[PDB]
């Protein structure tokens, strides 16, 4: 999706690329993730694009999703559980909720989860 | 002292056309929408003559009781922007009068005023055209530096108005002697030949050219 304008996560754009891929994969694996506010708000678009691709089940679509993610268990979850869950949902497959702050460094935390209830 | 026609508009972007001589002209597109006369300033009451115009759509829940009362006295629906035009013939305007983009014709020269794009805190090199030092040849951590900022004991001070780093942009800018290329009055669109200050979607005041032309 859109680039991030300012300095990237992890001290390098390559590390942010990797961080966002891993964070989206973990969100799909667990359904929800506590990942500080900025990381959640930054991985929401990529994860939503991946879910939208997973909404339609084809081999080419699964290969394209496997470009990202790269874990076939996560691809199976995304094309078997998460993807069918949003058949009537036109966007907005995830939500982010602020949770508090971390004691050690005052980092504002958040929970990003995949929408769990069916639209119908 | 001077008689000025004027309208309020929105910067929409830039395009290009070819005129009758097949010359490419850059045009700013201005949504010079409907402006209503919301107040009339007279020498008897305010000490000067002017027309306070209103332009723009506003949500009724975003207008306050003082603003609602002002517009109710004007007899118009609330507008987002109120801008005064200093004209010697402010006496010819009535409260609630509708002023459209057709105030200007197909070859009028106009002055366009807007708030320019902002750049944040710029250095001396960007905001004032300073030359720094060389990229090499010994230069020690002072490549984009202001150089000297004064003399010595006499005076033991930096003079007022020395050009230094600071926030640049977001300021009133008037571009003079811009030729109106075209006016589409029914949809309130104005093609003005040149570039005008501000980002897209910023409020523009289009007035008669003070110096007529060059």
């Amino acid at each position: 999706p859109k680039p991030t304008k300012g300095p990237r996560l992890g001290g390098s754009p390559a590390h942010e690329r990797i961080i966002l891929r891993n964070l989206a994969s973990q969100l799909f694996e667990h359904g929800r993730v506590v990942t500080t506010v900025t990381k959640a708000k930054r991985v929401r678009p990529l994860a939503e694009k991946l879910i939208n691709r997973a909404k339609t089940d084809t081999v080419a679509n699964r290969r394209f999703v496997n470009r990202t993610i790269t874990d076939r268990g996560i691809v199976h979850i995304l094309f078997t559980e998460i993807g069918p869950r949003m058949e009537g949902r036109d966007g907005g497959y995830t939500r982010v909720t602020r949770i508090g702050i971390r004691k050690g460094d005052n980092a504002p935390m958040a929970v990003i989860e995949v929408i769990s209830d069916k639209v119908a | 002292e001077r008689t000025v026609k004027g309208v309020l508009g929105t910067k929409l972007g830039m395009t290009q056309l070819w005129d009758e001589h097949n010359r490419l002209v850059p045009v700013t597109v201005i949504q010079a929408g409907p402006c209503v006369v919301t107040q009339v300033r007279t020498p008897e009451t305010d000490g000067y003559s002017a027309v306070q115009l209103g332009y723009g759509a506003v949500k009724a829940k975003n207008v306050t009781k003082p603003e609602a009362g002002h517009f109710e006295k004007a007899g118009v629906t609330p507008r987002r922007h109120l801008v005064e035009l200093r004209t010697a013939d402010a006496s010819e305007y009535t409260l609630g009068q509708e002023i459209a983009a057709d105030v200007f014709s197909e070859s009028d020269f106009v002055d366009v005023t807007g708030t320019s794009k902002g750049k944040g805190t710029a250095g001396v090199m960007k905001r004032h055209g300073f030359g720094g030092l060389r990229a090499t040849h010994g230069v020690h951590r002072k490549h984009r530096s202001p150089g000297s900022i004064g003399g010595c004991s006499t005076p033991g001070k930096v003079i007022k108005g020395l050009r230094m780093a600071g926030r640049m942009g977001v300021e009133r800018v008037t571009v003079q002697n811009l030729q109106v290329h075209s006016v589409d009055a029914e949809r309130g669109i104005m093609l003005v030949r040149g570039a005008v200050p501000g980002p897209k979607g910023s409020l523009l005041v289009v007035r008669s050219a003070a110096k007529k032309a060059a």
Binding site: - | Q16, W18, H21, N22, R23, L24
Partner: protein, 122 residues
Amino acid sequence: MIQQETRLKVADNTGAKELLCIRVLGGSKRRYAYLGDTIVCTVKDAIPGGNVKKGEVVKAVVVRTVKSHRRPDGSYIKFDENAAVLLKGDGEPRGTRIFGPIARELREKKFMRIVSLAPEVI
């Protein structure tokens, strides 16, 4: 754009082969010369049998810039080399043949012999 120390090829049969731009004429602090602009040059290369000798300070008119030239109709013209045509001090070519295509910018009421002698004017 042609500035001082730019070396241009010669589109004339004057015997000169390379010119070094010494000055761009047209005003104080003037930086660049474009199509149709006159420059002072020194002959860096010349044909051994020829009327123009190496190290001669001449005046040339610029044709064929590499950079680009904007035209009022919004179009641009571009060449592959920088070229110049030597002048006799009145605006008239020293040579008698013009080689390569020539910018239409030369036909701005100024350089008529160069246009007539040009094989192609673009």
